């Protein structure tokens, strides 16, 4: 029925789909500076038909939501992806190989696009834009709305110390803020490459700074030695062993806050992101402290303050002394009443892909997307999406893949779209 | 909430007599829509008043602003105008229902009009309030001298930064001296004040000594 | 026309039901002065249409904006609402007669409301024509292969630069081709931009050659 023209339709997009993910892809979005791929997102929106808002804490930092509207009583759904991407061309102070085309660049070869920020998160973004478009121009009859939602600063960087304000910010200007200001609906799918596998449980997470304090601080003539590491009036040295100690903490942790949830199996990792201690510029003093920064996961059913506490007993067993400052709390949920969504997602899946969907990984239902801020909200939220994820890391998609995701997505809606609320 | 009417015309070619649901002035519809939201809005807080242990909540309804044309060219009447109304929501409410309620205000009217959320916020009641509430009281009762009365339903049908702390897994209450400048209290007893104060600090004396 | 009501609530704590003229929310109370300005202004331009050697003029009414609180801070509603009308005058009416009219209206509702003119300019119908009426009328048989008509009462009834001519002691007119884009028109035929440009031409070769 209306199903088969809308397949036929996405059938004949092929070009679109391809050109849409390379030209999105190609754009430099690292967070801080989503703004032109979210024009370009606008721009398409707008020739498309599907009444673009911009909507956004700033002016160069935004979402874009648009909107398919139905005919009047049906089930709203939206589809959701990010605008920013991974690697600034700045960041060799994380990666040793800076600037590497996959990084940076997307192009179209062999029915593959390749690309970081084709997988990740362009690619499965282009997937509904034209999901959305055949919809459209099929003239599927829906009852409920198709909510478009691109979002900014997806991506886990945030602000801490002297990095404040609009270039460090990310999620509370992303996905939450866009929904808290209008981009609302019954259900929503997050599109993210999970090789066509759902998850509707990720983890929140709190980030911890960890300072150690030493001292006294003395010019290197004057140097205490030999001192013991644990004793060291160097805090770079304290912090060392502390190090160790988080180190072996974090491998029992991940192990006993794992748990398994009716949308996956969460398993809960810590890793040590950054350090400073003392500044290059002036080494002739060690430093009386020492700050690390860490990146710790928590299952929905996790306090912050336990992990907090936990901490703050590996320092004290160590006999140190340090601050354990956390300068990130955001929840992790499950979805609750995602059936209609779950339903109509495997009836579409089952068709256009050809079996039933198997289990996501646990690494994919560990980590931060954007059904959190859906469900926080009370719109029950999974993700689904074409590729390997990046987080693996793929670097392509295969256009036949991405193919499949958006008739997935057009029939998830033509589904659920005409179930009354 | 946007109203659509037109086709504009220069003030010399505007047709009358026309039915006001029927005007070309998108101002003169809204006016007859205003009308019936308000009907609909002293309904709304009936209907959904709930009962909840941490309050009662009477959510409540106001067009809080209206605008339709442009005070600077006013030789051509507007084509739209649009309305832009707090909804208060209990706890339990989804927005979508509340949206699609005014929706339904509107098309029973025949009139052509988009209702465009443009903010969301969920309300909530504390979870595991007791031992603050516990501590809390205990301090009230000594220093103002009585048991804690239960709060009006405005108090407990607003907005207040309980919400965030109880979305993020804090339990959360609010308590302070003072009328409610909402409302329209004016002034402080210093007296008042210094038994919050003290409130406040037996409170925490409490609190921060129970082991997590 | 500014209504006034009030005082204004916070949301929560608005009372309801109230009926419409006695909201404290303005938005509401010029709702319902705006349908009786629009049954005022249905009878106005029956009573002021008035016959002239130069047209007919059928002075109209619209409201032509409105605005009442600011669409970013919604939470409280606004103690005021102003709409801007848009009243046209036959030569013959002094404005403050229609100022006082309105004022009229809005007292029979029984509302406070401040009436407040922002511009007011005269029509004129010229005198003294005869001399420009006779050559654009030899040059327009001419040309055109007609007498002319009488204008429509909207195109005698608007805002044109003739107003300032007249009023300067300079007979002025008001002629050329196409429907009024008030109407509103959306094309000119070339053909008759030509004829428009031949009958200027033959008004000027006509009028001046006569003498002052
Ligand atoms: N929660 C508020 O702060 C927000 C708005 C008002 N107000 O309308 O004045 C009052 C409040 C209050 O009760 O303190
Ligand atoms: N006098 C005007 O120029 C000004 C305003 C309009 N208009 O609002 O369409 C029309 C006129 C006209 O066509 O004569
Ligand atoms: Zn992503």
Redesign the interface.
């Known amino acids: 029925n209306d199903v088969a023209k809308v397949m036929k339709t996405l059938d004949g997009m092929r070009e679109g789909l391809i050109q849409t993910a390379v030209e999105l892809g190609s754009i430099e979005a690292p967070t801080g500076r989503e703004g032109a791929a979210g024009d370009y997102v606008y721009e398409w929106m707008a020739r498309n038909g599907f009444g673009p808002e911009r909507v956004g804490v700033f002016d160069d930092r935004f979402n874009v939501v648009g909107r398919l509207r139905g005919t009047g009583g049906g089930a ?1 759904l939206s589809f959701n992806s990010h605008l920013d991407t991974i690697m600034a061309r700045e960041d060799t102070a994380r990666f040793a190989d800076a600037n590497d085309r996959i990084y940076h660049e997307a192009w179209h070869e062999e029915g593959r696009i390749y690309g970081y920020s084709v997988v990740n998160c362009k690619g499965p973004m282009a997937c509904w834009l034209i999901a959305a478009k055949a919809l459209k121009e099929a003239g599927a009859a829906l009852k409920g709305d198709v909510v478009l939602t691109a979002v900014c600063g997806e991506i886990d960087c945030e602000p801490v110390d002297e990095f404040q304000g609009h270039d460090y910010l990310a999620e509370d200007i992303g996905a939450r803020y866009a ?4 981009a ?3 259900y929503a799918l997050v599109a993210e490459a999970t090789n066509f596998k759902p998850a509707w449980v990720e983890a929140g997470k709190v980030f911890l700074k960890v300072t150690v304090f030493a001292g006294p601080s003395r010019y290197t003539p004057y140097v205490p030695r030999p001192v013991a590491a644990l004793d060291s009036p160097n805090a770079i040295v304290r912090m060392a062993k502390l190090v160790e100690a988080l180190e072996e903490w974090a491998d029992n942790y991940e192990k006993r806050y794992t748990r398994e949830y009716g949308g996956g199996t969460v398993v809960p990792k810590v890793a040590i992101g950054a350090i400073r201690g003392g500044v290059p510029y002036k080494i002739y003093a060690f430093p009386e402290l020492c700050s690390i920064y860490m990146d710790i996961r928590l299952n929905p059913d996790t ?1 912050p ?2 992990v907090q ?1 936990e901490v703050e007993a590996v320092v004290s067993k160590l006999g140190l002394k340090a601050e354990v400052k956390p300068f990130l ?1 955001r ?1 992790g949920y499950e979805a609750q009443g995602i059936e209609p969504l779950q339903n109509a997602l495997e009836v579409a899946h089952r068709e256009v892909v050809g079996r039933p969907t198997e289990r996501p990984g646990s690494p994919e239902c560990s980590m931060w997307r954007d059904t959190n801020p859906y469900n ?3 719109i029950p939220s999974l993700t689904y999406g074409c590729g390997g994820g990046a987080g693996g890391g793929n670097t392509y998609f295969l256009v036949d893949d991405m193919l499949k995701a958006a008739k997935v997505y057009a029939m998830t809606a033509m589904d659920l779209c005409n179930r009354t ?1």
Request: hydrophobic share 35%; net charge neutral; glycine share 12%.
């Open positions: 709203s929904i808290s200001h209008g609302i609906s019954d306090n303050l336990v506490r709390f929840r926080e909200l009370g609320p």
